[PDB]
């Protein structure tokens with residue numbers, strides 16, 4: 001609707017019903033939408049979570065209306081209802097009218113005067129049961145799509161991106177290294193991996209990799225340093241002969257003016273990542289979920305389509 | 309001119325009877341025509357429990373039970389055409405022979421439909437190049453299916469035609485060196501060539517089945533449809 | 546002390562860690578976890594996440610509240626105690642202000658430990674109820690979101 005639409009402006013028929021995304025919990029959504037923000041229009045109104053459920057009567061029905069208005073009235077703009085725990089988990093289960101009328105608000109806002117269809121739509125809920133609501137109608141939200149825990153294999157892409165993507169027009173790496181070997185077990189066999197090891201495959205493992213550069217050897221043995229007043233073999237008098245406190249009685253000669261040295265390099269203080277640090281990291285696996293949930297969630301996944 | 313039923317409930321203390329009295333006044337102020345009413349779950353009158361509970365709110369239903377039924381019994385000018393689906397959420401203090409009867413049901417056609425032909429007839433206004441109408445193969449869909457997704461499938465077919473012409477113009481861009489010094493200025497090129505070809509539609513690729521065979525799950529076919537179909541007779545009458 | 550009395554918290558860190566007996570390499574890993582980002586900053590003067598928060602869930606009668614002030618004393622952390630429910634107030638629409646206040650005072654006292662004692666007082670089940678979304682939910686979810694979403698960049702607080 002924005003790359004080819006400008007060359008196919010005739011735009012024959014129905015508008016796009018946006019995003020009916022779902023996936024596994026804790027993953028798979030905002031990391032996409034926040035980047036899609038590069039071309040959405042204005043920086044979209046990512047309001048989300050409980051924020052709709054203001055107070056007993058009217059307030060949510062005011063705010064949602066002004067939300068859609070102030071979103072569209074400048075430019076195309078997404079929203080971020082995400083989980084339907086925000087709105088419309090079921091009919092009933094309400095008090096004073098907080099939810100169910102604002103559900104019917106949603107069904108009436110979604111028509112007629114969006115300004116530009118580049119409003120799209122965006123829902124992103126985990127665990128796409130607990131909706132049971134008419135907004136699944138094709139003219140109200142688009143087709144369902146899953147975000148899921150894959151096989152390990154894409155972890156190599158994930159790792160290399162995380163290492164190399166974040167840049168300051170510098171070609172910097174978050175965790176600089178030269179590859180000591182191929183990923184081997186890391187790409188394809190790294191753990192039981194039923195739950196994903198998430199950023200926790202790199203977080204803390206980073207500090208472990210830093211320890212082999214900052215704590216081992218010198219810092220565990222001496223205070224390393226160079227230039228300035230420095231240590232000297234003063235040899236002025238015996239340390240303890242006349243009394244137990246002769247040592248360091250005299251003060252230093254001068255205060256330092258200034259000194260210059262780079263903060264980091266491939267030579268020093270960098271992360272020096274290795275395959276065996278990732279071996280330690282995967283030994284310290286913490287899978288985000290277990291099959292005792294996925295046996296239920298898999299049902300919740302597959303029953304969401306072809307089934308209701 | 310219709311009640312917009314979810315909106316316009318004022319929160320303010322004892323105010324909102326004003327909005328019901330105003331909306332029916334403004335309705336009657338046009339002599340001849342109906343008011344649409346959404347699901348009555350827009351009002352969701354629910355006999356005092358597990359919800360609004362009739363206490364801190366009664367102000368809409370306590371008026372609507374009376375005054376528009378007075379008009380309805382004089383039976384002139386203004387008429388109701390509500391679209392209820394979930395009577396289990398409603399008190400049935402309306403929806404009854406004593407006030408607002410004619411609980412009217414149709415169901416969803418099983419498979420024998422002229423609405424497939426009317427589907428074709430409304431994919432029309434955009435061209436199908438074939439001489440044969442080729443509609444009937446859509447009935448390869450498993451029966452009990454005939455919902456609004458008919459036009460979601462026309463949308464998917466149109467998007468497939470769009471994808472075809474998009475990759476065709478991408479091919480033309482790739483070979484644009486045949487008439488420009490570089491494969492450049494696409495955003496100028498399409499406008500300065502403009503050799504018609506103005507998204508003329510390509511329903512010939514029959515891609516409505518190519519969508520339908522995915523079992524496009526925005527259709528509803530579950531036991532919930534059977535629930536509605538049975539309770540419409542068993543309680544909806 | 547005059548600063549802490551006028552602007553900071555009452556009852557400053559004031560106890561000998563020597564008195565917290567019996568805790569073992571558990572206190573080792575705890576203390577090292579709060580020591581190292583405080584006094585070995587070359588390993589920690591970096592943009593990644595760095596163990597910004599902890600919680601405790603032991604039964605009563607093993608002293609948590611004591612060890613919190615003690616570890617704070619071990620590195621002269623700035624100290625603020627949320628004494629339980631005093632986030633609450635009459636004014637729906639303003640009671641959340643004490644939450645922004647917590648990060649205001651923390652940011653004003655960069656090397657700080659923030660301690661929610663009896664956190665249950667502002668932490669029901671996050672999946673609380675199918676009843677109304679009362680103030681007890683709106684305060685706690687906003688707090689959890691903000692303590693997830695801010696000071697996560699302005700590193701330094703605990």
Ligand SMILES: Nc1ncnc2c1ncn2[C@@H]1O[C@H](COP(=O)(O)OP(=O)(O)OP(=O)(O)O)[C@@H](O)[C@H]1O
Nearest residue numbers: 564565566567604605606607608609610611662663
């Ligand atoms: N080294 C120690 N090891 C274990 N317990 C100790 C130690 N030193 C003191 N205590 C005991 O710990 C008790 C504190 O128990 P606990 O932490 O459950 O209470 P609290 O601080 O009132 O709790 P809360 O965290 O719920 O506010 C003190 O009464 C004290 O007797």
Ligand SMILES: Nc1ncnc2c1ncn2[C@@H]1O[C@H](COP(=O)(O)OP(=O)(O)O)[C@@H](O)[C@H]1O
Nearest residue numbers: 024025026027028029030031126158196198199
């Ligand atoms: N490649 C990745 N795989 C999984 N999670 C990621 C990845 N990259 C970033 N994240 C995490 O995604 C989180 C936000 O995504 P989201 O799916 O909204 O999580 P949640 O479902 O918990 O809200 C961030 O905390 C970020 O650290």
Ligand SMILES: [Mg+2]
Nearest residue numbers: 609610662663
């Ligand atoms: Mg305590």
